[PDB]
């Protein structure tokens, strides 16, 4: 339920091939940027860094939970379907 990991913008690159090491079966890679994650305070800061380094970027707009009306008294309603059968 914590929301502390959804407060900063991040910049991750596309995933490249990982194969199986013939000796031990480990996960091998040839992508130097497979573990590169950058943190930005704002979307415009992230876009500025991407364009400065020449990378092509796709921006996903932030998704914020919408405010919700929560009433504990609706659990016991005279004529509504919000009455709960168990507590």
């Amino acid at each position: 339920s914590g929301v502390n990991n959804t407060k900063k913008w991040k910049m991750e690159f596309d995933t490249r091939e990982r194969w199986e090491n013939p000796l031990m079966g480990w996960a091998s890679t040839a992508d130097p940027l497979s573990n590169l994650v950058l943190t930005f305070s704002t979307k415009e800061d992230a876009v500025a860094f991407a364009e400065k380094n020449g990378w092509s970027y796709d921006v996903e707009e932030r998704k914020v939970p919408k405010p919700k009306s929560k009433s504990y008294g609706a659990n016991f309603s005279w004529n509504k379907r919000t009455r709960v059968s168990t507590k």
Binding site: S77, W78, N79, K80, R81, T82, R83, S85
Partner: peptide, 9 residues
């Protein structure tokens, strides 16, 4: 009368 047969209606 509540107006409905039950809360599940």
């Amino acid at each position: 009368s509540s107006g409905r047969e039950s809360p599940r209606h």
